[PDB]
Symmetry: C3
Subunit: 334 residues, 3 copies
Amino acid sequence: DLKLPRQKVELVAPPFVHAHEQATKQGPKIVEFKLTIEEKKVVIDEKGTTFQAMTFNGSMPGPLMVVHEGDYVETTLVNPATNTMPHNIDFHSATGALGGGALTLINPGEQVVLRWKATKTGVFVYHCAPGGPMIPWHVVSGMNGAVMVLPRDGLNDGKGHALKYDKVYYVGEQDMYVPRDEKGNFKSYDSPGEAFTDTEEMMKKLIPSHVVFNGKVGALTGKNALTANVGENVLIVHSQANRDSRPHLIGGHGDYVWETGKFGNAPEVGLETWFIRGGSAGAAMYKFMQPGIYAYVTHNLIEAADLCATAHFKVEGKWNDDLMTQVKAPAEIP
Amino acid sequence: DLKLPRQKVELVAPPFVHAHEQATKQGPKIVEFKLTIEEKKVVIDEKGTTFQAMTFNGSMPGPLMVVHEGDYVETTLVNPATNTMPHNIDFHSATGALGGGALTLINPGEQVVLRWKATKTGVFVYHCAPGGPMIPWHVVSGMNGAVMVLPRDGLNDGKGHALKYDKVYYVGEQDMYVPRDEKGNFKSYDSPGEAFTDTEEMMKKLIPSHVVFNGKVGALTGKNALTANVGENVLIVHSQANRDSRPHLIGGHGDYVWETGKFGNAPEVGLETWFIRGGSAGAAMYKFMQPGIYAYVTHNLIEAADLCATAHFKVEGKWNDDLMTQVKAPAEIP
Amino acid sequence: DLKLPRQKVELVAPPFVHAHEQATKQGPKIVEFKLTIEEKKVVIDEKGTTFQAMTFNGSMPGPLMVVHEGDYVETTLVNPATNTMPHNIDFHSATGALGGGALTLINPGEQVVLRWKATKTGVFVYHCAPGGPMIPWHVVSGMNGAVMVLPRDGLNDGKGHALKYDKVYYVGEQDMYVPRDEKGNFKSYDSPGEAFTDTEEMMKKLIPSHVVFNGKVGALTGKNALTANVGENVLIVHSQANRDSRPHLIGGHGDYVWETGKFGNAPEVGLETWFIRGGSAGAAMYKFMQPGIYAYVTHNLIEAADLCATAHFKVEGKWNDDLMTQVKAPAEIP
Ligand SMILES: OC[C@H]1O[C@@](CO)(O[C@H]2O[C@H](CO)[C@@H](O)[C@H](O)[C@H]2O)[C@@H](O)[C@@H]1O
Ligand SMILES: OC[C@H]1O[C@@](CO)(O[C@H]2O[C@H](CO)[C@@H](O)[C@H](O)[C@H]2O)[C@@H](O)[C@@H]1O
Ligand SMILES: OC[C@H]1O[C@@](CO)(O[C@H]2O[C@H](CO)[C@@H](O)[C@H](O)[C@H]2O)[C@@H](O)[C@@H]1O
Ligand SMILES: O=N[O-]
Ligand SMILES: O=N[O-]
Ligand SMILES: O=N[O-]
Ligand SMILES: O=N[O-]
Ligand SMILES: O=N[O-]
Ligand SMILES: O=N[O-]
Ligand SMILES: O=N[O-]
Ligand SMILES: O=N[O-]
Ligand SMILES: O=N[O-]
Ligand SMILES: [Cu+2]
Ligand SMILES: [Cu+2]
Ligand SMILES: [Cu+2]
Ligand SMILES: [Cu+2]
Ligand SMILES: [Cu+2]
Ligand SMILES: [Cu+2]
């Protein structure tokens, strides 16, 4: 009965984002996505700590889905028989049925197809939510991602001017709760079910052992640093499905920031640090002015430096001595 | 000397709100309220955990008081002789004398009458604040509520359009600190005074044992679910006198949100999750589009699902398949 | 090559702020500041608890630096040989080289001179950031302050009207992590290096032992209360380099608040409590209407009353009975 064109999207792993238009002359379509749930034991730090992860499409965060206002998002959610638990999906962008959660509960061996109309613009969390105490556990195990619903005319600054990004990255931040044994070492478990009792006990005390971007300490550093060039406008979408975060680009700013993440509201300008409320996504754009390394952090610096929540940008281009210069290099005090 | 008409209000227990006008053709009046303090041992969870509560009018939160800009709010605060402690009241809506606290300290057996002019619009916390370390203790024991100061022309969207709600609910969120004994069971106490030493020790560690709406786990579920119909615009006032919260309506949105709670500022639009700073009230309105059950939570999902901070809405009306539909019910993977 | 006039500033200790113009007819200048790092053991509470502090210019917070948009800020950072550790400086107001941190690392016995162009208006954090796990440790040891970059036309309300303050105060809030011994007493250490292992262990658990303004419990009370008169417009700049805060003026309001701290955005009006994201500064102005004592707090009241985060204002002037009056003093219940 819904007679619109269908478009398939090939999702890509974060922090990258599948190809899409900002402004578009397309009208509404049914945009088709597939998410396959994977439960897996992963390594989350450089010491080799393991973690019983539960993921959409194998990644933490789940991939960014991008559509336009008035599109219909049709998701095939697949829970292979190789998984152990039921799962579902709640889209904060969607209206009704607990975001879709009440229509998508699938046992191992099942799949389901949900369609929702993208009536609200912005960046939004999606996450699993199977019921009761399982809700936080599946979310903090990694089962969360985001979806971006763009205006058909692209982004604007609330003063009539278009804001076009040259690239977009998705940084998903994950609070993780890994219990310790008596002597103080992190515990390893054979299954998510086996990890549950100790992990819930820790969860209820509200202090994570790790806070990471893209699923691991250091994920977005070295070979996998984010990149830009001087003169490039970069959009950084940041999500946190369970706990607050305060993003900050060290050596830069948020030129235009939607900290609550919703494009019906004008962006704020010229921020140092912004705030992602737990259960939300927000977005910040910045035009790089200087080359070199930047760190992108949550500005609880204990979390950033000690618990895992640091990414890098490596930026190419020409240094601008008008903006900053070392007038006198380090020298002995006279 | 103040020669205005007097109007009595009969307060009602949360989450309901006493009858009031949004837009009004009344001019300023002296609006008369009575709050009677009650210290009492209550049950706060489905396991039968007890808690030494201290309340305005017997409830957590204290009732919502509603007036209009330029009204004078005249409160008779009563501390019956059956209570054990001194108490007072600080209105964040008021100007001077620590919000009224410096003019309202009453021993058991006393009452006091305070008047303040409602010069600031919005939703505001009120709470007890007797001095020193007693301040946090009385607040986290339950002695907090809110007051709404409406513009005389009612609410607007900051773009010239009236925003009229069909109903309003007040959700007061309470962080509670219940100590445990050596074997890990919650402790019970014979009096607030007896609970104080153990409770303060826990308080200073900044992790609540319970986070509840309307005073108890499950208070706003089952028979006492919040209700609406498709097409109804519902205002949800949310307060937290001591600790941050991040409200979220699962399956809905905040169509118009004043997260800082103050009507001199335009609302933000189309939010997924909003943020109530500890020590404040905020407000969100939503027009329901779909029938069914919704959950209203703080979106720290550990707090929501595990510590008590979940309410339900039951919504009547016709399902809208354009907004959401289950294209294919759960089935075996091909 | 940069041929502008040079102006020296004599910094003053917080909460006071060096003399400056709001609106100015001066054009851009090179504004010269000197910061001398001091590592020192200090007393942080009325019980005599000691703390291994690391400071810019001897104070926590470091002093407020005030310039105008388009000025060049030239800082001589000095690390005397009497210190033990390397240090540097990151300005959130600056563009490039990790805010200056990558250009300012100095060993004991060295100094460095950094210049940055003040292209972003607002209040901004500055802090030390020597690398890795040292970053949070130096910040939570006290090595943070703020810089205010004013529009050349002064502040405005976003509706065309000037906002001129009669005085400005800088409240720097510091989360401190002081370990305890087995019997529960705070530990003392002979050096910052000796304090590091125990202090890091505690830091990673994300619960401070103390949260203070101006470096000590009670710093901004008694002789050192903040002051005002009825009719005076006071700007309160609040910073927190590592952890969120929720300022509140008990008995007052935020008449105009930039909670994200950036003057390119209009202020919000009529707030009760505002929110300083960790890693940022914000600012609130209030015109006092009533005499008497006010408390200025973070409205986690446990932190305010029990962990140290309370300042006072003493305000002179005439009481306004229209705004507030005690209709009936405390009396026996009829
Ligand atoms: O940036 C959103 C903000 O901008 C305003 C103009 O101040 O509206 C603009 O953006 C709307 C949503 O994209 C457009 O529909 C509108 O035409 C455009 O002016 C605000 O109304 C809005 O809050
Ligand atoms: O919603 C408050 C927001 O709306 C504006 C118009 O953009 O003012 C409106 O609301 C005021 C307060 O109710 C009215 O007095 C005013 O007349 C009306 O236009 C903003 O000024 C305000 O921030
Ligand atoms: O208060 C900042 C806010 O005000 C507006 C007007 O609504 O611009 C004013 O402030 C700018 C920055 O100081 C001035 O350049 C501008 O001329 C003045 O109108 C907004 O554009 C801005 O967000
Ligand atoms: O050693 N088990 O906690
Ligand atoms: O500047 N950030 O640590
Ligand atoms: O290298 N000292 O001047
Ligand atoms: O058993 N008392 O903590
Ligand atoms: O969608 N909320 O868990
Ligand atoms: O029910 N299985 O297709
Ligand atoms: O007594 N040392 O922790
Ligand atoms: O009103 N403040 O506690
Ligand atoms: O002092 N009693 O009315
Ligand atoms: Cu799941
Ligand atoms: Cu959710
Ligand atoms: Cu009390
Ligand atoms: Cu208060
Ligand atoms: Cu340092
Ligand atoms: Cu920083």
